[PDB]
Design a protein around this ligand. Structure first.
Ligand SMILES: *[C@@H]1O[C@H](CO)[C@@H](O[C@@H]2O[C@H](CO)[C@@H](O[C@@H]3O[C@H](CO[C@H]4O[C@H](CO)[C@@H](O)[C@H](O[C@H]5O[C@H](CO)[C@@H](O)[C@H](O)[C@@H]5O)[C@@H]4O)[C@@H](O)[C@H](O[C@H]4O[C@H](CO)[C@@H](O)[C@H](O)[C@@H]4O[C@H]4O[C@H](CO)[C@@H](O)[C@H](O)[C@@H]4O[C@H]4O[C@H](CO)[C@@H](O)[C@H](O)[C@@H]4O)[C@@H]3O)[C@H](O)[C@H]2NC(C)=O)[C@H](O)[C@H]1NC(C)=O
Ligand SMILES: *[C@@H]1O[C@H](CO)[C@@H](O[C@@H]2O[C@H](CO)[C@@H](O[C@@H]3O[C@H](CO)[C@@H](O)[C@H](O)[C@@H]3O)[C@H](O)[C@H]2NC(C)=O)[C@H](O)[C@H]1NC(C)=O
Ligand SMILES: *[C@@H]1O[C@H](CO)[C@@H](O)[C@H](O)[C@H]1NC(C)=O
Ligand SMILES: *[C@@H]1O[C@H](CO)[C@@H](O)[C@H](O)[C@H]1NC(C)=O
Ligand SMILES: *[C@@H]1O[C@H](CO)[C@@H](O)[C@H](O)[C@H]1NC(C)=O
Ligand SMILES: *[C@@H]1O[C@H](CO)[C@@H](O)[C@H](O)[C@H]1NC(C)=O
Ligand SMILES: *[C@@H]1O[C@H](CO)[C@@H](O)[C@H](O)[C@H]1NC(C)=O
Length: 328
């Protein structure tokens, strides 16, 4: 009780929301380009109309002026300009586990409106119940992550999660679903929306319309003698420079087109370990000081501590880590 509540205090304040997901088979995010129209773009103005979207870190921004032989494949690989480039580091076939310290994935029983007393009580009570040792029972997870999943600990990831927790989605999503208003996708063109979209057959200005239109080939045209400052012509245009068209289409403000295609990324059940539960159990055998020291170094497996990262972004890949760690 005295040493149990002391171990709980230390284990909770440090590792309450820290978990280790093991992929059945190491499977990285399969594409270099991400189509996520549900997220608003940064916009041309100095001050954006939307608060910073973490996904903007991966934005393949179109610049109107580029050197004579500039192509998008130099910085953004196969990604479409105007959408997102997923860097090498977030699609590493060597990563076998996903370490994260975050409370953004809890289901409805956890929320800020509740006092910290209620949240802490309910989380430790669910962690005890939903674990065999330090391993979470399948019922704690979403069904998509593991068969028999009932969201008793973690909620399902949603369409907007990638806008604010991009690494969580790239690393944990079992399926990639596009959200697209790009002309050509799902065979929807500016000419056939009156046939592909049932709710349309001709109100909000954005009704029955695509966002980005198919222009043609990507090219750099040098009109003047300056060969370091030529006219860039992208494959697609944003004709009215709209930055939240897709976000408003998602938030169901009006009728019109939407293209949602799925790509299976990870197959087979995840294994999830609770680092608070591991802390609580290993401290009875090795002592709180060595368990706290060891689990802290485990959170620094990459050189940057995961518990010191912002909650929305504290999702990192590890290569064949030894868990539980060696306790001195
Ligand atoms: C990371 O992981 C996250 C977790 O998995 C993931 O989140 C999930 O994201 C997906 C993708 O956005 C979400 O699913 C979609 O939900 C759409 C909305 O559904 C509601 O509205 C519909 C419209 O009225 C209802 O039908 C629908 O009811 C159904 O679902 C209920 C549960 O939600 C269920 O209880 C009901 O019984 C019922 O079955 C619900 O109320 C939905 O519209 C969408 O469906 C399309 O896309 C699917 C995937 O490709 C297709 O399988 C499906 O058939 C639909 O495709 C059609 O429509 C598209 C346009 O919307 C077209 O592009 C397609 O080509 C296709 O169109 C053809 O067929 C039409 C008729 O079927 C026809 O009219 C057309 O002409 C054409 O022939 C899909 O289910 C999911 O809900 C999210 N999960 C959670 C928990 O939030 C996240 O996205 C991932 N992130 C990243 C970055 O990858
Ligand atoms: C999280 O995602 C899972 C899917 O992976 C959701 O579970 C599924 O939810 C649907 C809609 O409620 C269930 O469909 C219903 O099934 C009953 C019969 O079981 C049927 O009578 C209804 O007509 C309807 O089709 C589906 O059973 C269920 N699937 C599984 C495997 O559980 C879940 O609801 C999402 N969680 C939350 C909290 O949003
Ligand atoms: C651009 O490409 C052409 C064709 O390969 C080449 O001849 C030319 O020197 C390049 N321009 C510059 C400014 O390097
Ligand atoms: C994966 O590990 C192997 C062996 O150490 C290495 O050759 C390869 O470059 C690594 N891949 C990435 C994407 O770092
Ligand atoms: C977990 O909680 C449920 C709900 O009270 C209960 O039925 C179940 O027996 C509990 N499991 C354990 C390990 O006590
Ligand atoms: C788009 O058209 C091609 C045939 O030209 C077809 O194979 C493909 O499945 C269509 N896609 C959709 C989503 O309708
Ligand atoms: C994480 O490890 C690196 C060595 O790779 C070290 O420089 C850094 O101080 C460690 N962080 C902590 C909190 O000890």
């Amino acid at each position: 009780r005295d040493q149990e509540q002391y171990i709980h205090r230390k284990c909770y304040q440090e590792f309450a929301h820290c978990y280790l997901v093991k992929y059945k088979t190491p499977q990285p995010w399969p594409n270099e380009g991400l189509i996520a129209d549900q997220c608003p773009l940064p916009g041309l103005a100095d001050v954006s109309f939307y608060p910073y979207q973490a996904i903007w870190d991966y934005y393949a921004k179109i610049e109107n002026i580029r050197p004579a032989n500039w192509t998008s494949s130099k910085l953004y690989g196969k990604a479409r300009m105007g959408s997102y480039y997923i860097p090498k580091r977030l699609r590493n076939i060597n990563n076998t586990h996903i370490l994260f310290c975050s409370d953004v994935l809890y289901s409805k029983w956890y929320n800020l409106q509740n006092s910290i007393l209620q949240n802490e009580n309910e989380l430790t009570k669910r962690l005890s119940n939903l674990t065999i040792g330090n391993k979470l029972k399948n019922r704690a997870l979403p069904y998509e992550w593991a068969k028999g999943g009932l969201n008793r600990l973690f909620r399902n990831i949603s369409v907007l999660d990638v806008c604010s927790r991009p690494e969580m989605v790239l690393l944990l999503n079992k399926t990639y679903y596009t959200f697209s208003l790009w002309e050509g996708d799902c065979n929807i063109t500016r000419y056939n929306v009156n046939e592909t979209v049932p709710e349309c057959k001709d109100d909000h200005p954005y009704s029955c319309r695509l966002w980005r239109y198919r222009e043609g080939k990507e090219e750099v045209k040098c009109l003047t003698s300056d060969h370091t400052r030529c006219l860039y012509y992208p494959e697609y245009s944003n004709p009215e420079a709209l930055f939240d068209f897709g976000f408003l289409s998602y938030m169901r403000n009006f009728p019109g087109p939407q293209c949602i295609e799925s790509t299976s990324i990870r197959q087979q059940d995840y294994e999830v370990y609770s680092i608070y539960q591991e802390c609580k159990l290993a401290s009875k055998t090795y002592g709180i000081d060595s368990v706290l020291f060891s689990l802290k170094n485990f959170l620094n497996y990459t050189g940057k501590p995961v518990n010191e990262m912002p909650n929305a972004r504290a999702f990192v890949g590890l290569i064949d880590p030894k868990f539980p760690p060696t306790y001195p």
